Design a binder for this molecule. Structure first.
Ligand SMILES: [Zn+2]
Ligand SMILES: [Zn+2]
Ligand SMILES: [Zn+2]
Ligand SMILES: [Zn+2]
Ligand SMILES: [Zn+2]
Lengths: 322, 48, 341, 80, 117, 77, 384, 183
């Protein structure tokens, strides 16, 4: 009424206020006279034209046309400077992740070393089949002619010493004739020793995976026992039926004049399950010791009599089925 | 200056009167401007 | 240690292997070096019991791979906190002074690559050396600066004393903050107000049981539809129901949250939301009036509600005019006291 | 490690209070914790050495009072 | 120019990432509780912290060492007995130097004269 | 509650029985014995028997106390 | 009345939809590792590829090694200073770049490993060459699992992503296609790709992601694009534990409505394996069938597509689902019995292709997804 | 004890500035379409003709010139938050590029002048200034503050940076955030 709120947002607010009252919110919807942009969203803000002008050398006119450089978003802005909630994982899932981490460590190191062995043995079988008069000035480019320029550097810097790895790399670049076979031999020895250790570790990883994996994939079942202790009580079972009745009585005054004469509905399509529960109960009666034998047998015919009397099952069928 | 941020003490009935007044104003100014544009277009089609 | 044993003519003969044992036994992620396998102490609980073909087609790829360069762009197309902002970070440490400053917090700010070559003193320390080097006392230089800057007299004492003050981050004084009681100050000095949650401690986020999470999505929790201080059922506003579920069909239970301002309970589906708003800003239900709106001029106009003011400086006034009183949108509702009907 | 600060300041006061001490300096607590640990590693080094003598892998209250016996002090009601 | 790093973080925003009431005088209550901890017989170190102490402090001597339940209780008692004797000796060496308050230097002398330093 | 829990098992009993019975293990795991050795020595797998009847027998054994809780849960899972 | 609860139908290929499949793999990608304690592993790429070779899938497709991107091809989307920092930073000289470490968000949660520039070059070259092969008609499906870095932005590295190769691929697609649809079935929101193409109508960015207090925080339903890109950025917020039937009944109507409304000429499909059940960081409950049903459904439209693999932090599950998805693109369904590969020890205990879903609560109620898809369908009415 | 009677409208403007800088992470558009000199010159040219006392005219010009000098010498020291110090650094480097020294009079807007006014009593209490000078400086600052209320709609406007380029504040980039609050 102060010429501040727009009609669209007023209609939206009344829709959030009187949505379930369909008759009233229509009176207003029209009593008012509403007939059915710039939606930026919460997670984007617009930079000025000063911050947009940053050199991207590879951009042509189409790239400058189709790429957005003014509207940006960040996880820190969307978090409201609070943070994020990681998904909670079981301890079996955590140790599965640790097994995978160790597996990745071993396989990454072994395969990097194997790729370097393949490149070095290509260099070695190239250098073996030539004489020594030009073997002195034979050099190797960075990357050793391979598509990577850093993988062999990583392998050398790991296998040899930290300070000596750089000078071994430089000696391989300058004089590969002497440095290549010894480096290849040391890498092959490290490869076979790492692979033997990896097999011995693979046994342990496989047995823990067999011990851990199905518990790790179980989410609700890992906490089902305490949940069943907490929620299969008298208070929760009263709460369920009372909540359904409260829902029915709350929605009775709005619509559905034939109010239902029931809250919970139970379906019993199979009758053998009654005999299965009776057998389980009989097994518990036979096993238990805190109940006296007369109390045990009274429990037995009480359960059998209630099942035979509540449902359509006869006592003869119960006796012949159990 | 404490008088600049004075909070208006308003009542429910005054809000009701103001809301009704302003919706009736808006509805009939758009209705009357639609009627005036219709009359002007009728005169334009008659003169043409 | 003579890696390349060159000859008399400079020719290479034979190199010596460096110390492999220097880092042959580095601890990996397994807790043991890659040289050795698992120990028995971890083999006891890992294995089930502990007592005291090469038809690979993965080598054919190199051959079956054809390079690809057919793109249109081929070829070419001292303290642990800052003395200015009281926050942690990389500091430039004062030599003759125990204060540390951020590289951006100084005047002028110092580049983290173009540092001072020898010594760096703070502004207060530099003023101290300037005072101790000069034979005259502080009030003599103050009077000389006042008399030399005869153009401005009243600000001259203000101009003199801030050369000695170390640079600090600007903070609003208390009397600007005490007039708004909703406005608080964060741990870093940042803004905080009534639309901000109490930050959850790490005991609540990561120190909780597996099934029970602050997200309230990993398990069926029916102790959220029940009011704690009343025991009644939290009825959602839009659907007018509480979908508590039954623990035999927990998929029939609809998640419910309460507003952080008026405590109006809302289902997660009636208002479209997937999160529970556990941390960050306080969640506002759709029923609350906005404190900021944008309207179209047909540019635009904005309106922001006035901030809350403490009772000693806040005046509530009652209009004499009932109808058409142009209030700024900042109002208060009074109770209504048969003829009016 | 984490349990050495587990011997808490009121507990050290309670030991001092059982010991008839009225006023206690603030620097008592941490070096008193140190005196406690030197005593503990001594006694349990003797007790564990008795334990792996017995071809055993648990220590017993009997072995504790036995170590105490070597160290000189005797405890009653804990075996022995 | 000396510099130091304290953020200890190569990047910011690490969290947003994917990886009228009575008052007894100062001193009055103490004698009331000297008597409380003296007439009482419980063990004055909390069992769970002390149990965890014995576990964390025994692990370095021998791996996987188990303790009989009574074994740590013998330790608990022996340690309290050790400390109450040392604290009587403390109070004695403190009242020596015209003082009521103790200070560590009291108990390093108390240990030095007993012959374990 | 018991009848619903057992009815969830019995309503899917035929498909889980057909899945367990037609469990074709891969060859390189059999040649290199990578599969789990147990859950067959103690008879916990459901091969050769009806799944729901085996659930009933396993639950009876668990009630009688001759079966551990963890092994019953592992067999069910 | 938009969402329909439908059980998950079995995956069936279309024999009338044979596609020439191009596979982009550089044997080096895997020899790069983010760190010691880091979840992102490029090693998942080559165990996925080892499953391609050992299934005999190389006889139905062409394997290419894309030329790695140079500095100024990366600058088609990123700034010069960010690519210059990326090409020069190493774990050795990390102290020489401290301002740029916090400027470009590199050093924590995006660590500096010494094959960073080469890894980014391989990823960007794979994406751009797949798009280029799609442009010239040499292939109908371009498969490149080396990339998928959808979180990287113009001047920053976020979410274990440094070079936004997907933006480079969509840029290369836009030179020959007027409308390119980007579909992100990664559990995280495709914030980099959506932010890059937020203001344009030429690219429709659809993201099926978990939206809670989860990374990257962006991806609200109201985020529909600004300017000329309004209603051209569809965000589908999902809750935890969405199963195969629920994800199918969400994915297929939205993508179908986009197909018959936006009518794209090329499709980029981000196949993030972190949407799978049992992921280290993901929180969904998709089996490998549920993950691959999206790829099979987008294959049915016949549009020339670029299958680009993104997240996935448990290597075994993402490798198995990428192998199944790749086999699905050759109009075959791979048998659930893994062949012998060199990484056979990962896939225990059954050593089968299947990724088993967890039994956790599908808390995505039909009413919430009905409202989400109703607002999404309402926003899509203006894309004709 | 020195007190300043700042109107609560300008107090709310300062608090909104604190909100925008620290919480919303917004910096000011620099240089503004209305600077600080420009406000201390228009106020002088408005209240210069309001009275015909030449000593009062001298005192007003003295106060304006002293406020300008104080603003220039103290802006780099204590007048801007930790977020805006990066913008201050880039302004200083841009000024050094073209070999003109940076003067905050012609660059920074009236909100930083309001910040100087708000923090001014603490600076007054920290110097050996006699009671008469403190009282008259507080009086002149109060008169400038009540002059600012009559023009509070043309110096301190409310505009979303996401909608208007002519807003007084601008949204920041993630790189600016990282460099400003990460090192
Ligand atoms: Zn100093
Ligand atoms: Zn600082
Ligand atoms: Zn509801
Ligand atoms: Zn509310
Ligand atoms: Zn992801």
């Amino acid at each position: 009424s102060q010429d501040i709120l727009d009609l669209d947002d007023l209609v939206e607010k009344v829709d959030f206020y009187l949505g379930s009252n369909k008759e009233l919110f229509t009176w207003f919807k029209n009593f008012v006279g509403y007939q059915e942009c710039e939606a930026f969203g919460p997670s984007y803000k617009r930079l000025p034209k000063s911050d947009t002008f940053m050199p991207c050398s590879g951009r042509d006119d189409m790239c400058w046309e189709v790429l957005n450089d003014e509207w940006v978003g960040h996880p820190v802005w969307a978090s409201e400077d609070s943070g994020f909630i990681a998904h909670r994982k079981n301890q079996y899932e955590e140790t599965l992740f640790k097994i995978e981490e160790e597996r990745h460590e071993y396989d990454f190191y072994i395969e990097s070393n194997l790729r370097t062995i393949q490149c070095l043995e290509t260099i070695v079988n190239k250098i073996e089949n030539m004489t020594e008069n030009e073997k002195a000035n034979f050099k190797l480019p960075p990357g050793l002619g391979h598509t990577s320029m850093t993988i062999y550097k990583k392998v050398i810097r790991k296998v040899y010493d930290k300070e000596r790895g750089f000078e071994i790399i430089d000696a391989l670049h300058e004089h590969p004739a002497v440095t290549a076979p010894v480096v290849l031999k040391r890498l092959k020895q490290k490869d076979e020793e790492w692979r033997r250790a990896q097999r011995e570790w693979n046994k342990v990883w496989r047995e823990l995976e067999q011990k851990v994996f199905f518990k790790s994939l179980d989410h609700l079942g890992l906490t089902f026992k305490q949940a069943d202790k907490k929620l299969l009580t008298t208070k929760q079972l009263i709460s369920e039926i009372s909540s359904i009745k409260v829902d029915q009585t709350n929605k009775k005054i709005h619509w559905l004049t034939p109010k239902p004469k029931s809250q919970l509905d139970f379906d019993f399509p199979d009758k053998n399950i009654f005999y299965d529960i009776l057998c389980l109960a009989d097994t518990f009666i036979t096993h238990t010791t805190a109940y006296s034998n007369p109390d045990k047998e009274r429990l037995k015919d009480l359960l059998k009599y209630f099942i035979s009397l509540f449902f359509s099952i006869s006592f003869e069928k119960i006796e012949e089925s159990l | 200056f404490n008088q600049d941020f004075k909070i208006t003490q308003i009542d429910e009935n005054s809000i009701k009167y103001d809301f009704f007044d302003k919706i009736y104003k808006s509805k009939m100014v758009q209705k009357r401007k639609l009627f005036q544009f219709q009359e002007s277009l009728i005169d334009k089609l008659v003169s043409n | 240690k003579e890696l390349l044993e060159k000859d008399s003519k400079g020719n290479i003969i034979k190199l010596n292997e460096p110390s492999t044992i220097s880092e042959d036994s580095k601890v990996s992620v397994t807790g043991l070096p890659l040289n050795k396998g698992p120990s028995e102490k971890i083999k006891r609980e890992s294995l089930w019991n502990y007592r005291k073909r090469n038809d690979l087609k993965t080598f054919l790829t190199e051959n079956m791979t054809e390079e690809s360069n057919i793109r249109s762009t081929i070829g070419w197309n001292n303290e642990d906190f800052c003395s200015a902002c009281n926050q942690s970070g990389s500091f430039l440490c004062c030599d003759t002074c125990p204060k540390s400053f951020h590289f951006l917090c100084l005047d002028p700010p110092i580049d983290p690559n173009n540092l001072p070559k020898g010594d760096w003193h703070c502004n207060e320390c530099k003023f101290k050396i300037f005072i101790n080097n000069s034979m005259a006392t502080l009030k003599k230089i103050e009077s000389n600066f006042i008399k030399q800057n005869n153009n401005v007299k009243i600000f001259a004492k203000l101009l003199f004393n801030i050369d000695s003050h170390n640079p600090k981050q600007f903070q609003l004084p208390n009397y600007i903050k005490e007039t708004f009681p909703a406005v608080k100050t964060g741990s870093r000095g940042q803004y905080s107000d009534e639309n901000d949650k109490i930050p959850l401690t790490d005991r609540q986020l990561f120190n909780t049981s597996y099934g029970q999470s602050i997200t309230k999505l990993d398990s069926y929790n029916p102790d959220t539809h029940i009011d704690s201080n009343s025991g009644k059922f939290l009825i959602c506003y839009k659907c007018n129901q509480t979908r508590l579920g039954s623990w035999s069909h927990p998929e029939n239970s609809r998640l419910i949250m309460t507003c952080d301002y008026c405590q109006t309970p809302w289902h997660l589906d009636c208002v479209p939301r997937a999160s529970f708003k556990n941390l960050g800003s306080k969640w506002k239900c759709p029923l609350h009036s906005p404190t900021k709106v944008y309207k179209k001029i047909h540019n635009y106009k904005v309106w922001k509600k006035q901030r809350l003011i403490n009772k000693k400086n806040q005046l509530y006034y009652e209009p004499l005019q009932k109808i058409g009183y142009q209030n700024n949108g900042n109002i208060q509702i009074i109770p209504t006291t048969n003829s009016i009907k | 490690r984490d349990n050495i600060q587990g011997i808490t300041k009121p507990a050290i006061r309670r030991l001092a209070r059982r010991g008839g001490v009225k006023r206690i300096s603030g620097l008592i607590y941490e070096e008193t914790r140190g005196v406690l640990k030197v005593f503990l590693e001594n006694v349990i080094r003797d007790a564990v050495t008795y334990t792996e003598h017995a071809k055993r892998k648990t220590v017993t209250a009997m072995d504790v009072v036995y170590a105490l016996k070597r160290q000189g002090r005797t405890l009653y009601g804990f075996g022995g | 120019a000396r510099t130091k790093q304290t953020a200890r973080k190569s990047t910011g925003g690490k969290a947003p990432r994917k990886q009228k009431p009575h008052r007894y005088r100062p001193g009055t209550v103490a004698l009331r509780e000297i008597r409380r901890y003296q007439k009482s017989t419980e063990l004055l170190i909390r069992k769970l912290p002390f149990q965890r102490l014995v576990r964390e402090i025994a692990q370095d001597f021998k791996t996987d060492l188990r303790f009989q339940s009574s074994a740590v209780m013998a330790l608990q008692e022996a340690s309290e007995a050790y400390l109450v004797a040392l604290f009587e000796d403390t109070n004695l060496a403190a009242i020596h130097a015209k003082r009521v308050t103790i200070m560590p230097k009291d108990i390093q002398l108390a240990r030095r004269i007993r012959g374990e330093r | 509650t018991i009848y619903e829990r057992l009815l969830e098992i019995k309503q899917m009993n035929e498909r889980v029985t057909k899945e367990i019975n037609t469990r074709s293990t891969v060859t390189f795991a059999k040649d290199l014995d990578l599969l789990s050795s147990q859950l067959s020595e103690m008879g916990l797998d459901f091969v050769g028997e009806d799944a729901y009847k085996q659930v009933l027998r396993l639950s009876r054994r668990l009630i009688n106390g001759d079966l551990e809780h963890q092994w019953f849960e592992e067999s069910l899972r | 009345m938009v969402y329909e609860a439908t059980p998950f139908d079995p995956i069936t290929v279309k024999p009338s939809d044979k596609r020439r499949v191009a596979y982009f793999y550089d044997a080096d990608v895997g020899n790069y590792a983010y760190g010691a304690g880091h979840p992102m592993k490029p090693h998942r790429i080559r165990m996925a590829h080892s499953l391609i070779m050992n299934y005999g899938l190389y006889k139905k497709m062409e394997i290419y090694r894309a030329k790695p991107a140079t500095k100024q091809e990366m600058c088609q989307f990123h700034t010069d200073e960010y690519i210059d920092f990326l090409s020069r930073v190493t774990p050795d000289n990390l102290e020489m770049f401290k301002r740029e470490s916090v400027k470009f968000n590199v050093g924590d949660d995006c660590p500096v490993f010494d094959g960073l520039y080469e890894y980014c070059s391989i990823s960007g070259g794979g994406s751009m060459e797949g798009a280029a092969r799609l442009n010239r008609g040499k292939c109908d499906v371009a498969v490149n699992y080396a990339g998928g870095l959808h979180h990287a932005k113009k001047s920053e590295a976020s979410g274990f992503c440094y070079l936004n190769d997907i933006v480079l691929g969509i840029i290369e697609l836009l030179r020959y296609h007027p409308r390119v649809l980007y579909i992100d079935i990664d559990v995280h929101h495709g914030d980099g790709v959506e932010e890059a193409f937020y203001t344009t109508d030429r690219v429709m960015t659809c993201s099926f992601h978990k939206y809670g207090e989860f990374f990257p925080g962006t991806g609200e339903l109201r985020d529909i694009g600004v300017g000329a890109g309004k209603n051209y950025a569809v965000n589908v917020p999902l809750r935890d534990g969405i199963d195969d039937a629920t994800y199918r009944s969400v994915f297929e109507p939205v993508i179908k409505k986009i197909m018959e409304w936006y009518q794209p000429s090329a499709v980029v499909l981000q196949c993030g394996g972190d949407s799978l059940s049992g992921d280290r960081l993901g929180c969904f409950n998709l089996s490998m069938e549920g993950h691959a049903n999206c790829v099979n459904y987008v294959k049915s439209f016949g549009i020339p597509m670029m299958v680009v693999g993104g997240g996935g932090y448990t290597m075994r599950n993402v490798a198995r689902t990428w192998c199944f998805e790749t086999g699905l693109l050759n109009n075959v369904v791979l048998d659930k019995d893994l062949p012998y590969n060199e990484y056979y020890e990962y896939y225990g205990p059954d050593y089968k292709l299947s990724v088993r879903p967890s039994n956790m609560f599908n808390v995505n109620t039909p009413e919430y997804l009905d409202k989400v898809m109703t607002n999404i369908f309402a926003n899509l009415e203006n894309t004709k | 004890k020195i007190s300043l009677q700042i109107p609560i409208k300008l107090k709310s403007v300062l608090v909104d500035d604190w909100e925008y800088v620290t919480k919303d992470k917004k910096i000011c558009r620099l240089p503004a379409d209305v600077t600080v000199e420009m406000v201390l010159n228009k106020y002088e040219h408005e209240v210069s003709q309001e009275l015909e006392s030449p000593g009062s005219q001298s005192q007003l010009s003295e106060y304006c010139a002293g406020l300008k000098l104080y603003f220039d010498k103290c802006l780099g020291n204590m007048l801007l938050y930790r977020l805006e110090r990066l913008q201050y650094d880039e302004l200083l480097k841009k000024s050094s590029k073209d070999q003109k020294p940076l003067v905050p009079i012609r660059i920074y807007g009236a909100i930083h002048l309001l910040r100087l006014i708000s923090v001014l009593p603490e600076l007054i209490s920290s110097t050996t200034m006699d009671l008469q000078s403190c009282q008259l400086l507080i009086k002149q600052t109060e008169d400038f503050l009540v002059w600012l209320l009559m023009h509070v709609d043309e110096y301190f406007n409310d505009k979303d940076p996401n909608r208007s380029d002519d807003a007084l504040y601008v949204n920041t980039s993630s790189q600016y955030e990282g460099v400003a609050l990460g090192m």
